[PDB]
Amino acid sequence: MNAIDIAINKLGSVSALAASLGVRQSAISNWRARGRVPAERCIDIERVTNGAVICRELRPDVF
Amino acid sequence: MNAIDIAINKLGSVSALAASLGVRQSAISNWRARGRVPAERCIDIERVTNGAVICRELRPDVFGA
Amino acid sequence: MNAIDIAINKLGSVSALAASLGVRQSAISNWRARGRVPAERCIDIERVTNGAVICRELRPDVFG
Amino acid sequence: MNAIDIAINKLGSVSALAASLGVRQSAISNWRARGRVPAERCIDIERVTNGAVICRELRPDVFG
Amino acid sequence: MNAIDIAINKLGSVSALAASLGVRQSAISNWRARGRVPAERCIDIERVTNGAVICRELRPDVFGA
Amino acid sequence: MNAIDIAINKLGSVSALAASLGVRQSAISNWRARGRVPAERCIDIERVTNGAVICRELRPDVF
Numbered sequence: 393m394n395a396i397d398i399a400i401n402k403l404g405s406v407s408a409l410a411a412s413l414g415v416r417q418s419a420i421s422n423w424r425a426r427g428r429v430p431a432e433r434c435i436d437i438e439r440v441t442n443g444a445v446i447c448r449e450l451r452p453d454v455f
Numbered sequence: 456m457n458a459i460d461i462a463i464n465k466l467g468s469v470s471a472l473a474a475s476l477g478v479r480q481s482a483i484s485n486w487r488a489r490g491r492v493p494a495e496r497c498i499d500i501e502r503v504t505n506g507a508v509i510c511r512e513l514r515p516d517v518f519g520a
Numbered sequence: 521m522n523a524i525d526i527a528i529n530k531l532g533s534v535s536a537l538a539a540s541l542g543v544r545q546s547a548i549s550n551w552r553a554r555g556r557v558p559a560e561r562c563i564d565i566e567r568v569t570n571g572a573v574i575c576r577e578l579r580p581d582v583f584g
Numbered sequence: 585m586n587a588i589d590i591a592i593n594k595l596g597s598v599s600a601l602a603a604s605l606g607v608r609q610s611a612i613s614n615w616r617a618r619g620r621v622p623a624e625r626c627i628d629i630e631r632v633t634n635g636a637v638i639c640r641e642l643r644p645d646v647f648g
Numbered sequence: 649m650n651a652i653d654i655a656i657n658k659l660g661s662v663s664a665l666a667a668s669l670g671v672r673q674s675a676i677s678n679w680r681a682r683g684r685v686p687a688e689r690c691i692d693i694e695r696v697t698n699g700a701v702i703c704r705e706l707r708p709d710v711f712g713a
Numbered sequence: 714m715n716a717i718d719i720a721i722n723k724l725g726s727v728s729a730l731a732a733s734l735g736v737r738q739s740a741i742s743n744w745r746a747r748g749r750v751p752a753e754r755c756i757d758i759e760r761v762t763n764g765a766v767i768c769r770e771l772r773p774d775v776f
């Protein structure tokens with residue numbers, strides 16, 4: 393499963409995830425479309441999802 | 456503190472660091488100019504420098520404390 | 521200490537040298553057990569060691 | 585070169601390998617003359633060689 | 649110069665050095681942390697490293713020049 | 714014979730040995746009681762005794 397989708401699963405919605413991270417919903421869409429969450433947002437997603445997804449899942453090329 | 460410079464000095468030269476990472480010297484020079492190594496190269500740098508620099512020193516905006 | 525040994529000291533560890541060459545640590549260990557590095561790795565060793573360990577020291581039979 | 589020979593190269597000498605295994609140098613020499621190491625020494629050889637010389641290479645009849 | 653690190657690198661890893669001396673890895677890590685191998689292990693280290701380090705390098709306060 | 718006792722034989726007294734080494738008489742007693750001269754004092758004892766006892770006699774586990 394895609395790591396972003398896991399994060400959406402945990403937050404319950406695109407708007408809730410976006411608000412949780414302080415980013416635009418368009419950002420989350422762009423991340424899903426490009427197949428890349430920004431490296432600098434990985435810890436924040438690991439945090440807001442309470443560990444449902446971790447950094448190495450989001451960006452194995454970085455972590 | 457300039458983590459990129461510590462890394463260059465650990466290997467001994469920009470050439471040696473570039474070689475150790477499989478990149479062009481110009482890439483290292485660019486990272487240094489902009490003060491930012493690519494996130495996906497931080498572990499590699501930590502490894503080739505034998506831990507003389509660590510990921511959090513290279514990209515504190517990416518790695519945890 | 522032989523050429524491999526000093527290449528390792530230069531990089532600081534087997535881990536660091538393996539990473540610098542794009543090989544597994546186990547490959548370095550195998551080279552040490554054989555007593556020599558593959559010819560095809562010598563150029564890269566010379567580069568990543570900042571010239572401290574040169575091709576002709578690694579493989580005199582190849583590089584003279 | 586066989587497994588014993590490369591274990592010796594890895595450690596650097598018969599002295600160094602004997603010391604690393606807690607055996608007399610004469611024991612190493614005896615193993616070489618027999619053509620194989622005792623099964624009970626294979627785990628330690630694998631360890632002290634940093635994995636370069638593994639049990640199954642030393643004693644295929646035991647370790648496969 | 650760090651004689652303990654030269655010894656670790658000669659064997660290839662802390663595990664291999666520990667094995668060669670019949671000690672726990674934690675012992676090697678402790679020696680390194682405190683910058684001092686036990687006097688009674690110096691000859692053993694000199695032997696297992698095939699002389700890549702010698703007793704006087706390990707414990708200059710114990711061995712002669 | 715005990716190596717420390719040989720050293721005392723050579724220096725002539727506990728105080729002379731202690732002074733020769735720059736240590737407390739209590740140190741020499743402790744060394745005798747514990748059955749261990751400090752490794753870092755072996756060369757000094759070999760020196761002050763002019764070779765009457767040598768390092769390998771004092772600490773065969775070290776030398």
Ligand SMILES: [Cl-]
Nearest residue numbers: 598612613616
């Ligand atoms: Cl032999």
Ligand SMILES: [Cl-]
Nearest residue numbers: 549634659660
């Ligand atoms: Cl190794």
